[PDB]
Amino acid sequence: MKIAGIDEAGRGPVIGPMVIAAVVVDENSLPKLEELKVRDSKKLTPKRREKLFNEILGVLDDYVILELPPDVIGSREGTLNEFEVENFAKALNSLKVKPDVIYADAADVDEERFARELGERLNFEAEVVAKHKADDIFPVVSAASILAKVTRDRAVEKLKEEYGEIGSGYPSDPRTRAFLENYYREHGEFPPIVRKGAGAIIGLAVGGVVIA
């Protein structure tokens, strides 16, 4: 009995990687995840959550951490969760050990629809059930969400090391928006860690509007 969890740390990042994590555990090993109180990993400190990260990779039968590029500045931010299904499928279809059941985390969309569309994107037959905030409900989804989180936080902690305070890496985050302006103001262009293309979001730099 192979159970799988899938989730992704963050939704529409502008900086850092977009991370999708899919994990697979045998039914007999599922309990171990709850014993590790994974659903209670959010309160955990980053440094303490890496503790779980490893405790988890020990109990898992398989796993896949997909690291994708960020979204373009103001990139079709309108219901940007349109890649959710595609990205999740991608990850799940990369798994060595195919699961018999998949538990996903839905993005405020029609739960029953999400699971259906997702199931059809997989290249293997399996039962799929998803729902809002699944990480609080299912441990496997919880564990999966931890792998994504750590991976995204490490990569961003790495970026700060080179670009100083950059915020969370999202367009909604103040320190990030500010960080992106100062960089421009003092380099006449956006850093190589951001991609520009289409969209329109607030972002002014002494005169004109760079961010959009």
mmCIF file of all heavy atoms in Angstrom, residues 13-48, unseen atoms left out:
data_model
loop_
_atom_site.group_PDB
_atom_site.id
_atom_site.type_symbol
_atom_site.label_atom_id
_atom_site.label_comp_id
_atom_site.label_asym_id
_atom_site.label_seq_id
_atom_site.Cartn_x
_atom_site.Cartn_y
_atom_site.Cartn_z
ATOM 1 N N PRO A 13 6.267 32.998 -6.647
ATOM 2 C CA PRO A 13 7.492 33.694 -6.252
ATOM 3 C C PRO A 13 8.074 34.493 -7.412
ATOM 4 O O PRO A 13 7.864 34.152 -8.574
ATOM 5 C CB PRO A 13 8.399 32.549 -5.811
ATOM 6 C CG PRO A 13 8.028 31.453 -6.757
ATOM 7 C CD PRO A 13 6.506 31.552 -6.830
ATOM 8 N N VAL A 14 8.793 35.562 -7.095
ATOM 9 C CA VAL A 14 9.427 36.389 -8.117
ATOM 10 C C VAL A 14 10.930 36.088 -8.111
ATOM 11 O O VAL A 14 11.601 36.168 -9.142
ATOM 12 C CB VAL A 14 9.181 37.903 -7.839
ATOM 13 C CG1 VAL A 14 10.109 38.761 -8.683
ATOM 14 C CG2 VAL A 14 7.733 38.255 -8.161
ATOM 15 N N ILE A 15 11.440 35.740 -6.931
ATOM 16 C CA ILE A 15 12.848 35.400 -6.723
ATOM 17 C C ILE A 15 12.923 34.002 -6.099
ATOM 18 O O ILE A 15 12.007 33.573 -5.396
ATOM 19 C CB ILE A 15 13.545 36.390 -5.741
ATOM 20 C CG1 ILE A 15 13.486 37.810 -6.280
ATOM 21 C CG2 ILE A 15 15.012 36.032 -5.582
ATOM 22 C CD1 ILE A 15 13.955 38.845 -5.260
ATOM 23 N N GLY A 16 14.015 33.292 -6.351
ATOM 24 C CA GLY A 16 14.162 31.974 -5.774
ATOM 25 C C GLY A 16 13.465 30.919 -6.593
ATOM 26 O O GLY A 16 12.750 31.228 -7.533
ATOM 27 N N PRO A 17 13.646 29.645 -6.250
ATOM 28 C CA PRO A 17 12.977 28.624 -7.046
ATOM 29 C C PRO A 17 11.546 28.374 -6.635
ATOM 30 O O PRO A 17 11.148 28.660 -5.511
ATOM 31 C CB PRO A 17 13.835 27.396 -6.797
ATOM 32 C CG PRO A 17 14.174 27.564 -5.344
ATOM 33 C CD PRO A 17 14.579 29.029 -5.287
ATOM 34 N N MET A 18 10.774 27.844 -7.572
ATOM 35 C CA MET A 18 9.405 27.459 -7.300
ATOM 36 C C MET A 18 9.667 25.979 -6.984
ATOM 37 O O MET A 18 10.233 25.263 -7.817
ATOM 38 C CB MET A 18 8.552 27.595 -8.566
ATOM 39 C CG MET A 18 7.143 28.151 -8.339
ATOM 40 S SD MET A 18 6.067 27.149 -7.239
ATOM 41 C CE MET A 18 5.032 26.304 -8.468
ATOM 42 N N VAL A 19 9.313 25.526 -5.784
ATOM 43 C CA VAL A 19 9.555 24.128 -5.432
ATOM 44 C C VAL A 19 8.292 23.294 -5.293
ATOM 45 O O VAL A 19 7.334 23.716 -4.649
ATOM 46 C CB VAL A 19 10.321 23.982 -4.097
ATOM 47 C CG1 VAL A 19 10.405 22.506 -3.714
ATOM 48 C CG2 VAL A 19 11.713 24.568 -4.210
ATOM 49 N N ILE A 20 8.305 22.112 -5.908
ATOM 50 C CA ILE A 20 7.190 21.167 -5.831
ATOM 51 C C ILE A 20 7.780 19.883 -5.252
ATOM 52 O O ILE A 20 8.797 19.375 -5.744
ATOM 53 C CB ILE A 20 6.545 20.826 -7.240
ATOM 54 C CG1 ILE A 20 5.717 21.993 -7.774
ATOM 55 C CG2 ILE A 20 5.571 19.658 -7.110
ATOM 56 C CD1 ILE A 20 6.527 23.125 -8.315
ATOM 57 N N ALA A 21 7.162 19.367 -4.196
ATOM 58 C CA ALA A 21 7.666 18.143 -3.593
ATOM 59 C C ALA A 21 6.598 17.069 -3.542
ATOM 60 O O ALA A 21 5.458 17.308 -3.104
ATOM 61 C CB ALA A 21 8.209 18.418 -2.189
ATOM 62 N N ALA A 22 6.989 15.888 -4.009
ATOM 63 C CA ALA A 22 6.126 14.724 -4.023
ATOM 64 C C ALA A 22 6.862 13.649 -3.234
ATOM 65 O O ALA A 22 8.061 13.419 -3.461
ATOM 66 C CB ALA A 22 5.880 14.249 -5.463
ATOM 67 N N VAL A 23 6.160 13.005 -2.299
ATOM 68 C CA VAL A 23 6.762 11.943 -1.493
ATOM 69 C C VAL A 23 5.890 10.707 -1.510
ATOM 70 O O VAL A 23 4.686 10.797 -1.740
ATOM 71 C CB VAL A 23 6.961 12.364 -0.009
ATOM 72 C CG1 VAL A 23 7.878 13.551 0.079
ATOM 73 C CG2 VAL A 23 5.620 12.671 0.637
ATOM 74 N N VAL A 24 6.507 9.554 -1.263
ATOM 75 C CA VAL A 24 5.795 8.282 -1.230
ATOM 76 C C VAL A 24 6.227 7.421 -0.038
ATOM 77 O O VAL A 24 7.414 7.173 0.163
ATOM 78 C CB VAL A 24 6.044 7.440 -2.509
ATOM 79 C CG1 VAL A 24 5.168 6.199 -2.480
ATOM 80 C CG2 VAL A 24 5.774 8.257 -3.759
ATOM 81 N N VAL A 25 5.250 6.976 0.746
ATOM 82 C CA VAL A 25 5.509 6.113 1.893
ATOM 83 C C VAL A 25 4.575 4.914 1.860
ATOM 84 O O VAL A 25 3.448 4.991 1.348
ATOM 85 C CB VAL A 25 5.264 6.828 3.240
ATOM 86 C CG1 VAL A 25 6.194 8.009 3.372
ATOM 87 C CG2 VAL A 25 3.799 7.274 3.343
ATOM 88 N N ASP A 26 5.040 3.807 2.425
ATOM 89 C CA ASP A 26 4.230 2.599 2.492
ATOM 90 C C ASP A 26 3.250 2.773 3.657
ATOM 91 O O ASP A 26 3.600 3.402 4.660
ATOM 92 C CB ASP A 26 5.140 1.395 2.726
ATOM 93 C CG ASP A 26 4.405 0.088 2.627
ATOM 94 O OD1 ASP A 26 3.634 -0.249 3.567
ATOM 95 O OD2 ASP A 26 4.589 -0.595 1.595
ATOM 96 N N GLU A 27 2.037 2.230 3.532
ATOM 97 C CA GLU A 27 1.034 2.358 4.604
ATOM 98 C C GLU A 27 1.559 2.047 5.999
ATOM 99 O O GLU A 27 1.203 2.723 6.967
ATOM 100 C CB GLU A 27 -0.183 1.462 4.349
ATOM 101 C CG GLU A 27 -1.415 2.236 3.893
ATOM 102 C CD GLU A 27 -2.736 1.520 4.172
ATOM 103 O OE1 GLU A 27 -2.895 0.338 3.779
ATOM 104 O OE2 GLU A 27 -3.626 2.158 4.778
ATOM 105 N N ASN A 28 2.393 1.016 6.092
ATOM 106 C CA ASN A 28 2.971 0.591 7.358
ATOM 107 C C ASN A 28 3.875 1.677 7.931
ATOM 108 O O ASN A 28 4.031 1.793 9.149
ATOM 109 C CB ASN A 28 3.813 -0.687 7.170
ATOM 110 C CG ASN A 28 3.045 -1.826 6.479
ATOM 111 O OD1 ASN A 28 3.635 -2.615 5.720
ATOM 112 N ND2 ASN A 28 1.735 -1.927 6.751
ATOM 113 N N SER A 29 4.480 2.476 7.061
ATOM 114 C CA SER A 29 5.398 3.515 7.523
ATOM 115 C C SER A 29 4.731 4.870 7.729
ATOM 116 O O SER A 29 5.328 5.778 8.302
ATOM 117 C CB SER A 29 6.544 3.638 6.527
ATOM 118 O OG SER A 29 6.888 2.352 6.021
ATOM 119 N N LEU A 30 3.489 4.993 7.275
ATOM 120 C CA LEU A 30 2.745 6.239 7.407
ATOM 121 C C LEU A 30 2.718 6.758 8.854
ATOM 122 O O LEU A 30 3.005 7.929 9.107
ATOM 123 C CB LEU A 30 1.311 6.045 6.887
ATOM 124 C CG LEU A 30 0.640 7.248 6.205
ATOM 125 C CD1 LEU A 30 -0.814 6.911 5.908
ATOM 126 C CD2 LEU A 30 0.735 8.482 7.086
ATOM 127 N N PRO A 31 2.375 5.890 9.823
ATOM 128 C CA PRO A 31 2.312 6.266 11.241
ATOM 129 C C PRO A 31 3.536 7.032 11.728
ATOM 130 O O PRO A 31 3.421 7.991 12.502
ATOM 131 C CB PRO A 31 2.173 4.920 11.942
ATOM 132 C CG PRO A 31 1.343 4.141 10.968
ATOM 133 C CD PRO A 31 2.008 4.471 9.648
ATOM 134 N N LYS A 32 4.706 6.591 11.274
ATOM 135 C CA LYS A 32 5.967 7.217 11.649
ATOM 136 C C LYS A 32 5.934 8.715 11.399
ATOM 137 O O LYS A 32 6.463 9.497 12.196
ATOM 138 C CB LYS A 32 7.121 6.582 10.873
ATOM 139 C CG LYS A 32 7.409 5.154 11.289
ATOM 140 C CD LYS A 32 8.715 4.630 10.696
ATOM 141 C CE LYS A 32 9.029 3.206 11.192
ATOM 142 N NZ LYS A 32 9.242 3.150 12.684
ATOM 143 N N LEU A 33 5.301 9.113 10.300
ATOM 144 C CA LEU A 33 5.211 10.527 9.963
ATOM 145 C C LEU A 33 4.410 11.285 10.995
ATOM 146 O O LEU A 33 4.738 12.423 11.327
ATOM 147 C CB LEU A 33 4.581 10.723 8.584
ATOM 148 C CG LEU A 33 5.427 10.275 7.387
ATOM 149 C CD1 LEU A 33 4.610 10.457 6.112
ATOM 150 C CD2 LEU A 33 6.723 11.082 7.335
ATOM 151 N N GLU A 34 3.348 10.670 11.501
ATOM 152 C CA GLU A 34 2.556 11.352 12.514
ATOM 153 C C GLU A 34 3.355 11.362 13.817
ATOM 154 O O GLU A 34 3.340 12.349 14.559
ATOM 155 C CB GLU A 34 1.202 10.665 12.729
ATOM 156 C CG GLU A 34 0.230 11.496 13.583
ATOM 157 C CD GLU A 34 -0.131 12.846 12.946
ATOM 158 O OE1 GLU A 34 -0.815 12.859 11.904
ATOM 159 O OE2 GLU A 34 0.271 13.896 13.485
ATOM 160 N N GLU A 35 4.063 10.269 14.091
ATOM 161 C CA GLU A 35 4.863 10.208 15.305
ATOM 162 C C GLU A 35 5.819 11.396 15.278
ATOM 163 O O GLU A 35 6.094 11.994 16.318
ATOM 164 C CB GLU A 35 5.663 8.893 15.403
ATOM 165 C CG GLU A 35 4.875 7.587 15.122
ATOM 166 C CD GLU A 35 5.723 6.308 15.336
ATOM 167 O OE1 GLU A 35 6.785 6.401 16.000
ATOM 168 O OE2 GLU A 35 5.323 5.209 14.857
ATOM 169 N N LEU A 36 6.321 11.751 14.095
ATOM 170 C CA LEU A 36 7.247 12.887 13.983
ATOM 171 C C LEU A 36 6.519 14.221 14.080
ATOM 172 O O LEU A 36 7.130 15.278 13.942
ATOM 173 C CB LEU A 36 8.018 12.824 12.671
ATOM 174 C CG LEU A 36 8.920 11.599 12.504
ATOM 175 C CD1 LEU A 36 9.453 11.553 11.078
ATOM 176 C CD2 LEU A 36 10.064 11.655 13.497
ATOM 177 N N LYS A 37 5.217 14.158 14.343
ATOM 178 C CA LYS A 37 4.380 15.345 14.466
ATOM 179 C C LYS A 37 4.645 16.316 13.311
ATOM 180 O O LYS A 37 4.920 17.499 13.540
ATOM 181 C CB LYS A 37 4.636 16.027 15.817
ATOM 182 N N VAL A 38 4.551 15.807 12.079
ATOM 183 C CA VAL A 38 4.786 16.614 10.880
ATOM 184 C C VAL A 38 3.747 17.706 10.678
ATOM 185 O O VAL A 38 4.075 18.805 10.250
ATOM 186 C CB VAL A 38 4.851 15.742 9.577
ATOM 187 C CG1 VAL A 38 6.100 14.875 9.581
ATOM 188 C CG2 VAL A 38 3.599 14.879 9.442
ATOM 189 N N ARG A 39 2.494 17.414 10.990
ATOM 190 C CA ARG A 39 1.439 18.410 10.830
ATOM 191 C C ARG A 39 1.713 19.612 11.739
ATOM 192 O O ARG A 39 1.134 20.686 11.552
ATOM 193 C CB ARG A 39 0.076 17.792 11.155
ATOM 194 N N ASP A 40 2.612 19.413 12.710
ATOM 195 C CA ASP A 40 2.998 20.441 13.684
ATOM 196 C C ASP A 40 4.377 21.022 13.377
ATOM 197 O O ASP A 40 5.058 21.530 14.277
ATOM 198 C CB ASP A 40 3.024 19.854 15.105
ATOM 199 C CG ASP A 40 1.648 19.408 15.594
ATOM 200 O OD1 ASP A 40 0.767 20.233 15.872
ATOM 201 O OD2 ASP A 40 1.461 18.092 15.699
ATOM 202 N N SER A 41 4.781 20.962 12.109
ATOM 203 C CA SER A 41 6.093 21.459 11.684
ATOM 204 C C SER A 41 6.146 22.959 11.373
ATOM 205 O O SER A 41 7.230 23.543 11.338
ATOM 206 C CB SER A 41 6.565 20.681 10.455
ATOM 207 O OG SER A 41 5.700 20.909 9.354
ATOM 208 N N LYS A 42 4.990 23.580 11.152
ATOM 209 C CA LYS A 42 4.961 25.005 10.847
ATOM 210 C C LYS A 42 5.515 25.837 11.996
ATOM 211 O O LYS A 42 6.387 26.692 11.791
ATOM 212 C CB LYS A 42 3.542 25.451 10.508
ATOM 213 C CG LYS A 42 3.099 25.027 9.114
ATOM 214 C CD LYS A 42 1.592 25.113 8.939
ATOM 215 C CE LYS A 42 1.174 24.615 7.563
ATOM 216 N NZ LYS A 42 -0.308 24.594 7.376
ATOM 217 N N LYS A 43 5.028 25.597 13.208
ATOM 218 C CA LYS A 43 5.524 26.350 14.355
ATOM 219 C C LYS A 43 7.049 26.200 14.434
ATOM 220 O O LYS A 43 7.756 27.161 14.737
ATOM 221 C CB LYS A 43 4.870 25.844 15.640
ATOM 222 N N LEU A 44 7.544 24.995 14.152
ATOM 223 C CA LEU A 44 8.982 24.703 14.177
ATOM 224 C C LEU A 44 9.879 25.812 13.636
ATOM 225 O O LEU A 44 9.489 26.555 12.736
ATOM 226 C CB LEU A 44 9.269 23.453 13.361
ATOM 227 C CG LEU A 44 9.262 22.099 14.045
ATOM 228 C CD1 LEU A 44 9.485 21.036 12.989
ATOM 229 C CD2 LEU A 44 10.356 22.037 15.106
ATOM 230 N N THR A 45 11.091 25.915 14.176
ATOM 231 C CA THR A 45 12.044 26.914 13.686
ATOM 232 C C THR A 45 12.692 26.347 12.435
ATOM 233 O O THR A 45 12.832 25.131 12.301
ATOM 234 C CB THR A 45 13.186 27.202 14.689
ATOM 235 O OG1 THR A 45 13.334 26.091 15.586
ATOM 236 C CG2 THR A 45 12.915 28.481 15.456
ATOM 237 N N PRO A 46 13.102 27.216 11.504
ATOM 238 C CA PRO A 46 13.732 26.705 10.288
ATOM 239 C C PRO A 46 14.781 25.647 10.579
ATOM 240 O O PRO A 46 14.750 24.546 10.022
ATOM 241 C CB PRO A 46 14.327 27.964 9.654
ATOM 242 C CG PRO A 46 14.539 28.879 10.833
ATOM 243 C CD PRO A 46 13.256 28.677 11.584
ATOM 244 N N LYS A 47 15.704 25.980 11.469
ATOM 245 C CA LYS A 47 16.785 25.061 11.827
ATOM 246 C C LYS A 47 16.259 23.740 12.406
ATOM 247 O O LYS A 47 16.894 22.694 12.264
ATOM 248 C CB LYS A 47 17.721 25.757 12.825
ATOM 249 C CG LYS A 47 18.046 27.197 12.420
ATOM 250 C CD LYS A 47 18.806 27.953 13.483
ATOM 251 C CE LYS A 47 20.172 27.339 13.735
ATOM 252 N NZ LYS A 47 20.868 28.003 14.890
ATOM 253 N N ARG A 48 15.096 23.796 13.054
ATOM 254 C CA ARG A 48 14.494 22.603 13.644
ATOM 255 C C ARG A 48 13.658 21.834 12.616
ATOM 256 O O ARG A 48 13.403 20.639 12.766
ATOM 257 C CB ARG A 48 13.633 22.990 14.854
ATOM 258 C CG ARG A 48 14.294 22.673 16.193
ATOM 259 C CD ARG A 48 13.649 23.425 17.374
ATOM 260 N NE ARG A 48 14.336 23.109 18.634
ATOM 261 C CZ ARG A 48 14.411 23.915 19.699
ATOM 262 N NH1 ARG A 48 13.836 25.116 19.685
ATOM 263 N NH2 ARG A 48 15.080 23.520 20.779
#
